[PDB]
């Protein structure tokens, strides 16, 4: 009851929550792990996903893009005709990271470069101007947002 | 004929029993406990006790679960308790170790279905 001293004991939604960087930390950072071996690409992506969770930094989402394959033509000996030699496929693994401090930036970068596996490429970049944020949104999120603008 | 604690249909687990079996699975030990509704515990079979440690390889395996299952079966038989109740979560009920632990109750003579209270 409101009058009784035990008022509000059932309150539960106050513990439940109802990109531009700061001047000390970064807004959003994405890493790209390209490789011609799918197993190595996802294994390292899983490795960095587990390690970044250990370091207690927020992760936005990890997804996949359509995989691009490239073929190789080889010049025939004593000739001038291009002939099919091999077909390769590059697999890109991306994990979105937001909220990485400037001081911890050097430590984070030195780890994944020191633990970089064979034949895979890493890259660190912002990827912020293309953040269209057009994600499908669920029903309860719409109701609170619609009540906010109403 | 004793009345059972009916109700609590909105929370888990229900309390319509006289004696309940509770199995606790920690990182290093698995604890099988049998207790009354009111809170008093009648008999227990934990891997911490030195009696079964000398004969078991590990305290956190299916072999350990069978070890305390037969121990609890013999303890319940010699304590006079024959009927009991078990209310597990879906995942632990689907665990292979638990089912063989229930098999220990069957071969030990322990039934996990309390008889219905006779109202009239």
């Amino acid at each position: 009851y409101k009058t009784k001293p035990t008022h509000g004991i059932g309150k539960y939604k106050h513990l439940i929550k109802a990109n531009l960087g700061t001047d000390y930390e970064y807004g959003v950072l994405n890493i790209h792990l390209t490789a011609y071996d799918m197993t190595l690409a996802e294994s390292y992506a899983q490795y960095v996903h587990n390690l970044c969770n250990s370091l207690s930094i927020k992760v936005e989402e990890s997804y996949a893009m359509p995989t691009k394959t490239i073929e190789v033509l080889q010049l025939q000996d004593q000739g001038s005709k291009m002939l099919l030699d091999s077909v390769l496929t590059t697999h890109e693994r991306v994990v979105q990271i937001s909220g990485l401090s400037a001081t911890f930036a050097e430590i984070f970068l030195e780890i994944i470069q020191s633990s970089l596996p064979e034949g895979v490429r890493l890259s660190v970049k912002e990827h912020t101007e293309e953040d269209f944020k057009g994600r499908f949104k669920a029903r309860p999120e719409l109701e609170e947002l619609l009540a906010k603008l109403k | 004929v004793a009345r059972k604690e009916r109700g609590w249909r909105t929370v888990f687990p229900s309390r319509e029993f006289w004696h309940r079996l509770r199995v606790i699975r920690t990182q290093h030990h698995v604890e099988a406990l049998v207790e009354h509704q009111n809170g008093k515990v009648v008999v227990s079979a934990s891997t911490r006790e030195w009696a079964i440690k000398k004969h078991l390889y590990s305290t956190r395996n299916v072999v350990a679960c069978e070890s305390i299952g037969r121990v609890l079966a013999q303890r319940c038989l010699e304590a006079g308790i024959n009927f009991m109740v078990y209310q597990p979560t879906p995942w632990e009920a689907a665990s292979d170790s638990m089912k063989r632990l229930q098999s220990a109750m069957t071969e030990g003579g322990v039934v996990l279905r309390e008889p219905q209270r006779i109202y009239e």
């Binding site: 400037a102 001081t103 930036a105 050097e106 970068l109 030195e110 470069q113 020191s114 633990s115 064979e118 | -």
Partner: protein, 228 residues
């Protein structure tokens, strides 16, 4: 201002160009990983042709057989040559050239004459107003004797510090001593000239870094350098 003089330092680091040697336990990794492959994988087209060729021969138009294609491809193996992981520097222990200890990391050290005695230390530079410590690190690279390299710079915060006091020789009220801050850097490409090699710089690993560094200086250094 203060009796503790300030210096900026750079620790040049070159990552290994080749992977570290595999522990024999990791040999059992790939051996089983391939072993769980063919036990779970299905027939490849190479095996499909091989089975069909064998079946038809037993019953009895492919000029090239699957076994034959293996032979020529294996024959081509004896034709080409792979790069040698162990180089001439490894045999000679050339602690100045790039081709020594390709499996592990390397860190540069330079000779400096302080207190009438040469001390193996990292490059250093005095701090000046209006310039960041990273600018001192860039200036430190420029001050190197006949150097031409580019260094990848990560972060801005220092990677460590080391405080040493004067041995009661120059120690004064205005100047008690000097402290130095290390900053990590990544070496992409570049090399020194051949005019001075032995008396200019040395490149070593973390394991043997203790032979050249002072025990106090090494202790501070080992707290941020790795052997991965």
């Amino acid at each position: 201002g203060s009796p503790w003089r300030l210096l900026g330092a750079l620790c040049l680091q070159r990552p290994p160009v080749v992977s570290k040697p595999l522990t024999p336990l990791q040999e059992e990794m790939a051996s089983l990983l391939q072993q769980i492959e063919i036990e779970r994988s299905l027939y490849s087209d190479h095996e499909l042709r091989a089975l069909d060729e064998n079946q038809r021969l037993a019953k009895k138009q492919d000029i090239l057989l699957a076994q034959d294609l293996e032979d020529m491809w294996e024959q081509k193996f004896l034709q080409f040559k792979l790069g040698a992981r162990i180089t001439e520097a490894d045999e000679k222990n050339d602690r100045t050239s790039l081709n020594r200890k390709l499996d592990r990391n390397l860190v540069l050290l330079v000779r400096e004459k302080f207190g009438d005695q040469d001390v193996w230390i990292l490059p250093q530079a005095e701090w000046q107003p209006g310039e960041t410590l990273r600018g001192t690190a860039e200036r430190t690279l420029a001050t190197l004797s006949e150097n031409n390299m580019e260094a990848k710079f990560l972060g801005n915060a220092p990677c460590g510090h080391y405080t040493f006091k004067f041995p009661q020789a120059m120690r004064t009220e205005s100047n008690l001593g000097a402290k130095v801050f290390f900053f990590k850097a990544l070496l992409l490409t570049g090399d020194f000239s051949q005019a001075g090699n032995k008396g200019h710089h040395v490149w070593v690993t973390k394991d043997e870094l203790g032979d050249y560094l002072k025990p106090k200086y090494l202790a501070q250094v080992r707290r941020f350098v790795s052997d991965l």
